[PDB]
Scaffold this active site. Structure first.
Site, PDB file in Angstrom:
ATOM      1  N   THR A  16     -12.844 -18.306   3.968  1.00  0.00           N
ATOM      2  CA  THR A  16     -11.377 -18.885   3.865  1.00  0.00           C
ATOM      3  C   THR A  16     -11.122 -19.419   2.635  1.00  0.00           C
ATOM      4  OG1 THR A  16     -12.164 -20.841   4.998  1.00  0.00           O
ATOM      5  CG2 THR A  16     -11.159 -19.064   6.428  1.00  0.00           C
ATOM      6  N   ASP A  39     -17.445  10.651  -5.220  1.00  0.00           N
ATOM      7  CA  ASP A  39     -17.584  10.230  -6.323  1.00  0.00           C
ATOM      8  C   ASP A  39     -18.438  10.914  -7.356  1.00  0.00           C
ATOM      9  OD1 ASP A  39     -16.651   6.815  -7.104  1.00  0.00           O
ATOM     10  OD2 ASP A  39     -17.884   8.015  -8.376  1.00  0.00           O
ATOM     11  N   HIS A  69     -20.872   5.321 -11.786  1.00  0.00           N
ATOM     12  CA  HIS A  69     -19.910   4.894 -11.173  1.00  0.00           C
ATOM     13  C   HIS A  69     -19.913   4.971  -9.631  1.00  0.00           C
ATOM     14  CE1 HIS A  69     -15.554   5.190  -9.525  1.00  0.00           C
ATOM     15  NE2 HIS A  69     -15.219   4.252 -10.557  1.00  0.00           N
ATOM     16  N   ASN A 161      -5.835   1.598 -11.519  1.00  0.00           N
ATOM     17  CA  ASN A 161      -5.999   0.428 -12.714  1.00  0.00           C
ATOM     18  C   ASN A 161      -4.847   0.471 -14.029  1.00  0.00           C
ATOM     19  OD1 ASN A 161      -8.332   0.099 -11.205  1.00  0.00           O
ATOM     20  ND2 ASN A 161      -9.278   1.321 -12.621  1.00  0.00           N
ATOM     21  N   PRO A 175       0.694   7.426   2.486  1.00  0.00           N
ATOM     22  CA  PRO A 175       0.952   6.417   3.503  1.00  0.00           C
ATOM     23  C   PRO A 175      -0.015   5.958   4.532  1.00  0.00           C
ATOM     24  CG  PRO A 175       2.946   7.546   3.003  1.00  0.00           C
ATOM     25  CD  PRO A 175       1.871   8.219   2.462  1.00  0.00           C
ATOM     26  N   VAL A 177      -3.493   6.400   4.679  1.00  0.00           N
ATOM     27  CA  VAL A 177      -4.765   5.808   4.173  1.00  0.00           C
ATOM     28  C   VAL A 177      -4.849   4.353   3.894  1.00  0.00           C
ATOM     29  CG1 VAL A 177      -5.636   8.111   3.812  1.00  0.00           C
ATOM     30  CG2 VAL A 177      -4.768   6.786   1.991  1.00  0.00           C
ATOM     31  N   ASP A 200      -2.063  -1.592   1.069  1.00  0.00           N
ATOM     32  CA  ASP A 200      -2.410  -2.067   2.400  1.00  0.00           C
ATOM     33  C   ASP A 200      -3.212  -3.472   2.254  1.00  0.00           C
ATOM     34  OD1 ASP A 200      -2.881   1.123   2.965  1.00  0.00           O
ATOM     35  OD2 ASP A 200      -1.527   0.056   4.253  1.00  0.00           O
ATOM     36  N   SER A 224     -11.906   0.649  -8.381  1.00  0.00           N
ATOM     37  CA  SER A 224     -12.876   1.325  -7.613  1.00  0.00           C
ATOM     38  C   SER A 224     -13.644   0.399  -7.146  1.00  0.00           C
ATOM     39  CB  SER A 224     -13.545   2.006  -8.881  1.00  0.00           C
ATOM     40  OG  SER A 224     -12.871   3.191  -9.521  1.00  0.00           O
ATOM     41  N   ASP A 260      -2.922 -15.813   0.029  1.00  0.00           N
ATOM     42  CA  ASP A 260      -3.753 -16.868  -0.959  1.00  0.00           C
ATOM     43  C   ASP A 260      -3.885 -16.134  -2.478  1.00  0.00           C
ATOM     44  OD1 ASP A 260      -4.320 -18.596   1.041  1.00  0.00           O
ATOM     45  OD2 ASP A 260      -5.690 -17.353   1.991  1.00  0.00           O
TER      46      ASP A 260
END
Length: 279
Positions: A16, A39, A69, A161, A175, A177, A200, A224, A260
């Site tokens: 938290t 990937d 990566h 990014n 939308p 995913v 999301d 990523s 937060d």
């Protein structure tokens, strides 16, 4: 279970508050789930994967990760030290070459591959796909991600990014995913993270330590890196029986730490992925 001196992002997803360094999680640890990492590949021989990683598909001359990566992202999903879901099975699909680049047609083929290939795998607790990749808007790329999700796979994708609205990038803008932005260890939006209504959830994305090729480790930054935190979290929650592939993104948003993060633009969700584990 408690992992002391964990990477900050693992500690963050079970807390938290920022500023702690122990990761707390149910010992089931994603056992019985599967996560596809779509990937540059995965160095499955890395000791950190403990035999739980394997390459299942490549579109290039090798299935090896010649970049790093994909190995880093897979480590955040499920490595013993650096991973969210430490007992999941990891399946690598190499749609990106060793320079990290890939044609959209190959990426689409890889997504449709996963939608079918899960029927050749044992994943009684459910299936997740982590897509730490993207480019400019493409309806065909978005539709492929939508199909993968529709087929019963929890699809988590990087927001991108560009410090820009993710509506102009794919598969970030699809939308249906789970589109993942990046935060830092002080609960600030990462400087590079895309934003916008299509996001999301946020996950840890700045200065993330994970596995690398050559049996090594390193800390790197990006959406990523945030994406596999969410993919691993989904696998973990599905193993616990708390949610399903079709509902996991919404459940993660429902149960997130709210309000937060700093520097979240008006109109972008202020939600940080959180496992709500009570030790």
């Amino acid at each position: 279970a408690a992992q002391t001196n964990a990477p900050w992002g693992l500690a963050r997803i079970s807390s938290t508050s920022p500023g702690t360094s122990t990761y707390y999680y149910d010992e089931s640890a994603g056992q019985g789930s599967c996560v596809y990492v779509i990937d540059t590949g995965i160095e499955a021989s890395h000791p950190e994967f403990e035999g739980r990683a394997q390459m299942v598909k490549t579109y290039y001359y090798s299935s090896r990760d010649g970049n790093g990566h994909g190995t880093h992202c897979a480590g955040t999903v499920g490595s013993r030290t650096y991973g969210v879901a430490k007992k999941t099975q990891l399946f690598g699909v190499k749609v990106l070459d060793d320079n990290g680049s890939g044609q959209y047609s190959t990426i689409i083929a890889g997504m449709d591959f996963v939608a079918s290939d899960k029927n050749n795998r044992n994943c009684p607790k459910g299936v997740v796909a982590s897509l730490s990749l993207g480019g400019g808007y493409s309806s065909s790329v978005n539709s492929a991600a939508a199909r993968l999700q529709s087929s019963g796979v929890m699809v988590a994708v990087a927001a991108g990014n560009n410090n820009a609205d993710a509506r102009n990038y794919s598969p970030a803008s699809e939308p249906s995913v789970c589109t993942v932005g990046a935060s830092d260890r002080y609960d600030r939006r990462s400087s590079f993270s895309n934003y916008g209504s299509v996001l999301d959830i946020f996950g840890p994305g700045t200065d993330i330590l994970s596995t690398w090729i050559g049996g090594s480790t390193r800390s790197i930054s990006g959406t990523s890196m945030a994406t596999p935190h969410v993919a691993g979290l989904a696998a973990y929650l599905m193993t616990l029986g708390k949610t399903t592939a079709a509902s996991a993104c919404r459940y993660i948003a429902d149960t997130a730490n709210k309000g937060d993060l700093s520097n979240i633009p008006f109109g972008t969700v202020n939600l940080l992925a959180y496992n709500n584990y009570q030790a």
